[PDB]
Paper text:
Among many types of [name]-Cas systems, Type I [name]-Cas systems are most abundant, with target interference depending on a multi-subunit, RNA-guided complex known as Cascade that recruits a transacting helicase nuclease, [name], to degrade the target. [name] is a multi-domain protein consisting of approximately 800–900 amino acids in the Type I [name]–Cas system and is responsible for the actual cleavage of target DNA. Our structural study revealed that, like other types of [name], NlaCas3 is distinctly composed of three major domains including the HD nuclease domain, RecA-like helicase domain, and CTD.
In the present study, we elucidated the first structure of standalone Type I-C [name] from [name] (NlaCas3). Following purification, the target protein was successfully crystallized, and its crystal structure was determined at a resolution of 2.17 Å using the molecular replacement (MR) phasing method. The crystal was categorized under the space group C2, with a single molecule present in the asymmetric unit. The overall tertiary structure of NlaCas3 exhibited a typical structural fold of [name], compactly arranged with the N-terminal histidine–aspartate (HD) nuclease domain and RecA-like helicase domains positioned adjacent to each other, thereby forming a functional unit that is capable of DNA cleavage and unwinding. Two prominent round-shaped electron densities, characteristic of metal-ion density, were observed around the active site of HD nuclease of NlaCas3. This metal ion density was coordinated by O and N atoms from the side chains of residues H8, H25, H52, D53, H118 and H119. Additionally, ICP–MS results indicating a 2:1 ratio of Fe2+ to Mn2+ binding indicated that the metal ions in the active site of HD nuclease domain corresponded to two Fe2+ ions. Conversely, in our isolated NlaCas3 structure, Fe2+ ions, which inhibit NlaCas3 activity, were detected, indicating an inactive form. When comparing our standalone NlaCas3 structure in its presumed inactive form to the structure of [name] bound to the actual substrate DNA within the Cascade complex, we observed that the HD gate loop from the HD nuclease domain and RecA1 gate loop from the RecA1 domain in our NlaCas3 structure blocked the active site of HD nuclease. When we compared our standalone NlaCas3 structure with that of NlaCas3 in complex with Cascade, the anchor loop of NlaCas3, which is utilized for binding with Cas8 in the complex, underwent significant structural changes when NlaCas3 was present alone and positioned in a completely opposite direction.
Numbering used by the authors: 4 to 80, 87 to 219, 224 to 430, 434 to 456, 461 to 700, 705 to 743, 755 to 791, 795 to 821
Write the structure that this text describes.
Amino acid sequence: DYIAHARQDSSKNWHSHPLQKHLQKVAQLAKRFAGRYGSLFAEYAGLLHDLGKFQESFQKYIRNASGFEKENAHLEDRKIPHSTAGAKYAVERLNPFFGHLLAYLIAGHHAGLADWYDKGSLKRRLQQADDELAASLSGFVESSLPEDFFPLSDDDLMRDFFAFWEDGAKLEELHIWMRFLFSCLVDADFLDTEAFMNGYADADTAQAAGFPGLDELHRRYEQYMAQLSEKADKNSSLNQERHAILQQCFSAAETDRTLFSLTVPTGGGKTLASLGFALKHALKFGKKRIIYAIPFTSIIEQNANVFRNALGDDVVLEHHSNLEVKEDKETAKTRLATENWDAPLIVTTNVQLFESLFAAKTSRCRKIHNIADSVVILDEAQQLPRDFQKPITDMMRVLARDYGVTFVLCTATQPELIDAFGRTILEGLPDVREIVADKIKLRRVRIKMPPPNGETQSWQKIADEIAARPCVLAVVNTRKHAQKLFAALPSNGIKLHLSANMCATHCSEVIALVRRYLALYRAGSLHKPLWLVSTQLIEAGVDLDFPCVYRAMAGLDSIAQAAGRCNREGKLPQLGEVVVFRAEEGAPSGSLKQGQDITEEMLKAGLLDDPLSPLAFAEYFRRFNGKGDVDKHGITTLLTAEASNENPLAIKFRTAAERFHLIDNQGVALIVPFIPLAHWSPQIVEANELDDFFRRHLDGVEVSEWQDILDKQRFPQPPLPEPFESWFGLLESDPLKHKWVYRKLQRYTITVYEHELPEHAVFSRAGLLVLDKGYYKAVLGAD
Ligand SMILES: [Fe+3]
Ligand SMILES: [Fe+3]
């Protein structure tokens, strides 16, 4: 009888997945995921997606080919194509609009959603599909299944369609709906197949064989907040303000609205307050999960640790980079190991989030349906790339209005107090409710700006200014700038280096070491000056407190975030010293260059005598929102649907997805074999335990010995370096059974530019790109 998949277990026996069962299960699970959002369309797509496997040629292939080809016989990427039979059947048995709509989902369920005319042209595939359809229907008739196994009804689709589109379909919003249904199809297909791979009858069965609910998470959060309150009852200025913010968040959580903002002072508890708002709001309005998306130029780990401490290990899913195998190493198992964000708390970048929302491929689109009915927290949303701000805010508008999503725009840009101005965080959204509107104290820093005449300082001159000072955090705008400044510093200090040339784990270890030095510094007990050279990745969620911060010229919000690491708690008996300098030009994205330009023009307008003032912030956001092309790459008209009697439904999914890939200048992921610190069977130190680790091995020890102690705790090697070698072998044996390795490798990835080039510098392994250890240095990372 007809099968959908075949697999071979480690004892070399063969198991097969019955086709009829898989079609029914995928239909039902897709309809379940699609919920109230026109689920009949998803059901039909699940029912039809594998119709082409009824071809006798397909069943013959899956029974007669080699072991590897039999296990990968459904990966059409010669294989026997099967995805387009069900697409053609939909077109033939339904009206033009519904039929072609479904054809997009069904025919893309392996290759990704296509363009109509151009890339992967769905028009050509349909015009060439008569044989595949006829053979599939032959097979289906030959089989046992009842005549009405495919009960395709225009009228029922009409009713479901108009239930979702009360006013008919908007040609410019149609792609969001089709991508959502495509997500339902893909996630249900993959989950059912993964059930089969583990021997279970269906996805529900595997689920019941073996995540706390948001109620338990909320109770944990309350326990954690209460012990934070008791543990450090400062009864201080800062604790008072944090309390006021938390109370306003808890109050605003009851409001029946979809767009909120949370504007607080730096060090004001932005993350924990946003999480409390989100938990309570989610419980009151039936949101199913919380998504926390931070700027791409961040250390995700450092933000995620707050959530890990508040709510425990098993709840937080950390997902930033794309660890995709190259197409040539895609197998059935790697295909199934993709992320669907079914976890209740997700920590991610806004690039991962919105590039998934605009994607064509199944690996990126799988997670999409789990975003509906969620709370999404955008940390510093105003830094979303300006040139994509129109599609992104259009996306957000639709998701908030029609798909149950709540957005909270968090920013630490509350001005230093005459607060007679509001701000528009994102120029394109409907009205956004500000959570902290109750007002009212003491200054924390003094800020110095570069000269209006526009002159720049050499790296040596800036290093000389820094080296004249006992303790400085210096923040620069690019990795090369970090290298040049670090090199320029003298060798009589303790100097350290952070940039995105370093993997997360390396960064977190440097951060913990800096904490130890700082604790010594604050007791008057560090015998060398302390200089940390970092990029902007430190301003996004790293909690460090320096007495002096040097900041390269940048947008006023970036300057405020930098000052947030200078006398952060307001505990020092003198104001912090913040020096904004103008060096060699540079910036990692056109949007950050735009911020720099706005700050320069404000400086030339004499508006920055008090750079954190209400006047300064209002002027910065008005000028920023007056500048830049908000859809530079034409996303909106690429994804706007064109209809006609000849071409019922034309959308450029494939071209749009590829064009959106420029949101980060085509970032390519790269795995780096940085040997981590571990403790004794060697176990790598958990990311939120590093601080305790450094205290246990270093407290009471002279600084002159620290390095040797640290070097002794590196992950032990055998008599690629070890953890990596075992990990890659685990991926090679069975990447779905050991898919957890993928998540581990996320801490040892950096992203570089497709532009940059030695021959064996980079190799491939387990389908993933890896850098040879010779090219990754202990201080600077890669180059
Ligand atoms: Fe398929
Ligand atoms: Fe399938």
